[PDB]
Structure formats: structure tokens, C-alpha cells
Amino acid sequence: MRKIIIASQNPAKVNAVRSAFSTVFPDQEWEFIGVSVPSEVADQPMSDEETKQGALNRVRNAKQRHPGAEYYVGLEAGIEENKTFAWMIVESDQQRGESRSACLMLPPLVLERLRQAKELGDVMDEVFGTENIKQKGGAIGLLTRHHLTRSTVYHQALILALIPFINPEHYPS
Amino acid sequence: NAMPPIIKRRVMRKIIIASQNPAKVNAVRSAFSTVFPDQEWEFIGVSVPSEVADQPMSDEETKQGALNRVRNAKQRHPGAEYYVGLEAGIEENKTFAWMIVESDQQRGESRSACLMLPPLVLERLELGDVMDEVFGTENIKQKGGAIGLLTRHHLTRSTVYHQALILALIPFINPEHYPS
Amino acid sequence: VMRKIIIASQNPAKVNAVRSAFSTVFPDQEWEFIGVSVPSEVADQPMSDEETKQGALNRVRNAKQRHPGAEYYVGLEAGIEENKTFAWMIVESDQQRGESRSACLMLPPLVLERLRQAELGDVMDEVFGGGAIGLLTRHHLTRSTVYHQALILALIPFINPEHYP
Amino acid sequence: VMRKIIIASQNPAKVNAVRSAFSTVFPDQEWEFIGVSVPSEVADQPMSDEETKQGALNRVRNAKQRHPGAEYYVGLEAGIEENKTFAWMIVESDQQRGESRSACLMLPPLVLERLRELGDVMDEVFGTENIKQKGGAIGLLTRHHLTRSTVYHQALILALIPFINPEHYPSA
């Protein structure tokens, strides 16, 4: 039963990983272990670079604290200018796969609030309403009339990050 | 060796799958992790009899097999929050599978979308062996199974089963609409 | 000078579903998709699997008669048996037929009771305040994504002529 | 009677992606979808995120100048940065712009070396017919758990968000 360390204890993030591995590798036995490690970047990364660095650092820090797992997974949401997205990092001992999720364009009122040093999730509640966000399953669910969800967007980025492991012949280590 | 100790991990309830087949455990893990993304469970397979044919030959027998697996899993392995049975079957020229999900008080169910089988496969009828004979062992493996092969990879057994597992979770998604 | 596909329904959602399935499976081919209205010769709301399938079959047959010359004809009909709803998909060319029933799901008791008292759409609208599938799954599935699978499965004999005929 | 949607591309696969995004989000509406050829005013193979987005912006601007009057204009431009590939989707009405970049894909070194036109290399490395029938490089590399179509579909839907939510995305 092979071990995957996820460098988050957030249920949504650990479940996204559960779904991605259970989908791509359906004949394998998997143990999923969420852990909390520091990112060494801002709690709310504000560039593409900082967001990806935060995910790399969490994976590195997870590897250091808990060596010996088959896979280590980082997933960090970030902002740059009027867009939000998340970096997915998957490392084995030998290989690293990466994908950034499809980006969402933020409303100009949201950007105005971010400029006032406000936290994105708070600003989303202000602009869309707390109950509205909750009942529609999140901002992406709300804005796309349920055609997408944060989770279905993250799912595709996790699968893309697994490409080097799906195709070891095309991605030597 | 250096994993976080179990006693330091997040406490979570269990989900029992009435199967040891990793593809079935994984299909269940994928469905729950999708539908209830803020809740977490440990997914555990167990071995229990269906008490019907190894290859169910009617819709009714296929459903009974999955119900029996869930019943037997509850009797032999008490304590989990949900029990899931997943059983493939045939009736006339169609194949499909029944998904049964039970909590302590409530049952959700869905039969997956059905596939017409080639006449030679029905005639030759273990279904797996026959699929290998008719399409080729390596062909079947490489395309992700018969469904994968037959649909030019647009569907696979797994993406078919995923929809039926979600549908079987309906009573638990909407407890106010499905009194138990 | 362009090939036709006749959908035995003027429902936009059903025409869209058929377009999407054919566009997925045959991305290179072009077709004029045409919704037509024809009798099912069964109840407006089929109350068994057999009746639901018969209705779709009848609609394809009637469409063939009324509108000859098309490359494919497609029937798509929803129905109920016990506490479940599902739909039968029937695709016919001039020589071949494929078919698939969509994944079934349990309807709320309140819905089934009020159904037994008379439309399905009117009932869900009142009970709930993507279709029924979209509402009941909280959008993890929709009617269009569930129908898409059954339509692709119904196309199997056409995709695989060596194995079907 | 019917409105036009101009796609700044005559790649059938791009036109078909756009038609599909519009059918999903606006299921009750009908458009004529029309593929056009216009300049990007950037490299034939954009080699940065910035350049890729600019090429898509430019194509939409040129499409509007050459083909005025349509309800929507769409640019869909693939590009590369470091070892990744992705596509910028830009949708404009007369009054508003939606945009999204698709989820990025790490390229095999064999492919990246042979750049030093991505499509040409993918055909050269994976085979022309395999790319066409099996869901593109995305389809081949994910063993069909994803396809180019299913990845594009997501970014096109995200790009339609302002037109879905005019109250939250004012044009001025």
C-alpha cells in the first residue's frame, strides 16, 4: 500500500489528490496522508512565481519531515494581477511533475479590495455574499452556473502534473 | 518508518467497500472525494460473498448480488459509516453494474448506463476471458478495457461507474428529500 | 450536399445532446442536426422501462417514415419504473441500431407521489424552489453529462462495424 | 436571422471548441460560428506567456476590424514558456472581454529539444494521425484521462464568466 504525503491538511485539497490518484492509477493501493508544513512565502501569494515557490517549498519541507513516501503533493492557490489559479506539484524520489490550473479573471471590485491588503476569501464573501458562495459550492461554481467548480478545475491540473509518472519513457529522471 | 504517527493524524470515519478489487475501492474513493470534498474518510475493502452467480445473468440477480455484498459486509465488518456494493451483470445483450450505498439508516442505488455486447461475446459466454479472446488481451489492456476500446477511449468502465456511484449518493446529498 | 441527422424530438436539450455526442465521437465529420416531432405511441410519461424503450423505438421508426434520407436517426426518451428514472437512447442508420439506457437514479418520494397524481418538471420546480440530475447531485452531474455517456454507448455498433451486424 | 461569432482561427478544432463552450453555457441560444484568418503580430510560435496572450488579443482586435458586427469574437492561441505549453482564450463582445489561460502541460525533453512550431514537432514525435484521433498531446500523455477538447472547454467556460455575470463584471 503506497504512501502519498499531501503537503496540506485541508480536506478539499487532500480529497482532490485522492480523486486524481484514484482516477489515474485505479489498479493501485494508495494511502493518503495530509500534513501541515510551512510554505516560506506569503499566506496569500501575489505572483505566479511566489505561488509556485510556495508549493515547491511545501513539498520539499514535507519530504524533509517525512522521508520514504512514494509521492509528495503540493497544491497552492495564488493571485497575479486580476487572475487566480493554483500550482500543483507532484514529486517522486526521482521526478517532479507540475501544472498550473486554468486561471479565473477576478471582478474589478475584488481587485480594488486586494489593493487594500484584504484577504481573497473575505473579499469574495463581500462581493458575492457568504451564503451565495457557500450554496453554489464556491466562486467558480457561482460564476459559471455550476459548469465548473474549483474541484473540477483542480482535478485537470493534478492529472496534468502526473504526466511524467503516467509516461516515464517521455520524461527520463 | 518516518510517516506521521497514526495517532497524530486527522480522525476520520470509515467507508467499507464490499470488494478487494483495487479498481472498485478506487472508484468509491473517487466518488466520495468528489461529492463530499470537505469531509474525509478512510476507504477499506473487505471480502464477503454475493451469494449469487459469479457472473449474474439478469438485472435482478446483479442487484441482489450487490445488496447481499453490502448486507454481508455490515454483518462481518460492523462500525463503518457507509457500506458500498458494486456488481457487474448481464441481461440479454446488455452489460451494466449495480451500485448500492448504505448508511445505518438509508440506502442509495443506481444502475450504470448499459453497453450492448457483440453477438460473438454473448455466444462465447468468464466474461473477461471472452473479452480477451474477441478483442485481444493486449488490446483490452491498452485501451482501458472493453468500454475504452469500444468507444475509442471516450468512455471507460471507470468513468461509467463514476456517474452511477454519484447517483447512488443522491439520498445522502439530499437527506431532506429522502426521509430515512 | 451535407448529411443529415434526424433527432426524433424538437427538444433543444435533446438536439444539443445528440450534436455533442456526434461531435465528440466523430470530430472530423459535419452534419445538419434536425429536430422533428413524431408520435411515440406510448404514454406521455412512460411508467416502465419497457414502455420507455418502446417509445424511443417508435419515435425513430416514425421519424424514418416521415423524414427519409438521413444518415442517422436518434430517439431519446425519459421514463420511470418503481422509484427510478432513466432514459433510453436509440441510434439507427439505414442498416444498424445501437441503444443504451442511461444510469438510473432514485427520485424523491414527494416527487413520485405527485407524479402518481398527474408533469415531472412542474413537480421538481415546486419541490426544489441541469435538470433533476443537476439539482439532486448538487451539479456533480447534469442531465447533459449523464445523457452524453448513454449516447456514446449507443454509438458503439457504428464505431465498431466488425463486431456488430 | 441569427447572430455571428467570429473565431480568430480556421483550425476546425478551435471553431468546434468554441461552438461547444457556447452550447454549454448558453444552451437556449443559436449562433453562426465563423472561423477567420487574421495576423497575431507576434511570433508564429510564441515563446512566452506574455507573447501568447498578446497574439490572442491582437487576433481578436484584427478580427473586429476586418469582420465588424458579430456578437462575440474569440481568440485561442497556444504558446510556450520554459518547458510548459498552454493556450490563452480571449472572448470579446462589443463591450466586454473575458479571458483565461488553460491548465499548463510539461513537455517531454525530446520535444523541447526539437523546438530549439510545436504542432509540427508533436506530429513528428507522436505521429500526425495519433495526435488527431486520440485527443492531441494531452490525450496521448494523460492516456485519455484528459483531452485537448476537455482542457480547452474549461478555459473557454472560465473566459465566458463576464458575459454570464454582467452585474459583477461591468464594461466601464
Curated annotation (Swiss-Prot), chain B:
It catalyses: XTP + H2O = XDP + phosphate + H(+); ITP + H2O = IDP + phosphate + H(+). Its cofactor is Mg(2+); Mn(2+). Pfam families: NTPase_I-T. It is an enzyme of class 3 (hydrolase). GO terms for biological process: nucleotide metabolic process; thiamine metabolic process. Binds 1 divalent metal cation per subunit; can use either Mg(2+) or Mn(2+). InterPro entries: ITPase-like_fam (IPR029001), Non_canon_purine_NTPase (IPR002786), NTPase/PRRC1 (IPR026533), YjjX_NTPase (IPR050299). Its EC number is 3.6.1.73. Keywords: Hydrolase, Magnesium, Manganese, Metal-binding, Nucleotide metabolism, Nucleotide-binding. One of its GO terms (molecular function) is ribonucleoside triphosphate phosphatase activity. The keyword Kinase does not apply. Belongs to the YjjX NTPase family. Homodimer. Phosphatase that hydrolyzes non-canonical purine nucleotides such as XTP and ITP to their respective diphosphate derivatives. Probably excludes non-canonical purines from DNA/RNA precursor pool, thus preventing their incorporation into DNA/RNA and avoiding chromosomal lesions. This is Inosine/xanthosine triphosphatase. The lineage of its organism: Bacteria, Pseudomonadati, Pseudomonadota, Gammaproteobacteria, Vibrionales.
Swiss-Prot record, chain D:
Its cofactor is Mg(2+); Mn(2+). One of its GO terms (biological process) is nucleotide metabolic process. Keywords: Hydrolase, Magnesium, Manganese, Metal-binding, Nucleotide metabolism, Nucleotide-binding. Its EC number is 3.6.1.73. One of its GO terms (molecular function) is metal ion binding. Binds 1 divalent metal cation per subunit; can use either Mg(2+) or Mn(2+). It comes from the Bacteria. Pfam families: NTPase_I-T. It catalyses: XTP + H2O = XDP + phosphate + H(+); ITP + H2O = IDP + phosphate + H(+). The keyword S-adenosyl-L-methionine does not apply. Homodimer. PANTHER family: NON-CANONICAL PURINE NTP PHOSPHATASE_PRRC1 DOMAIN-CONTAINING PROTEIN, PTHR34699. Phosphatase that hydrolyzes non-canonical purine nucleotides such as XTP and ITP to their respective diphosphate derivatives. Probably excludes non-canonical purines from DNA/RNA precursor pool, thus preventing their incorporation into DNA/RNA and avoiding chromosomal lesions. Belongs to the YjjX NTPase family. This is Inosine/xanthosine triphosphatase.
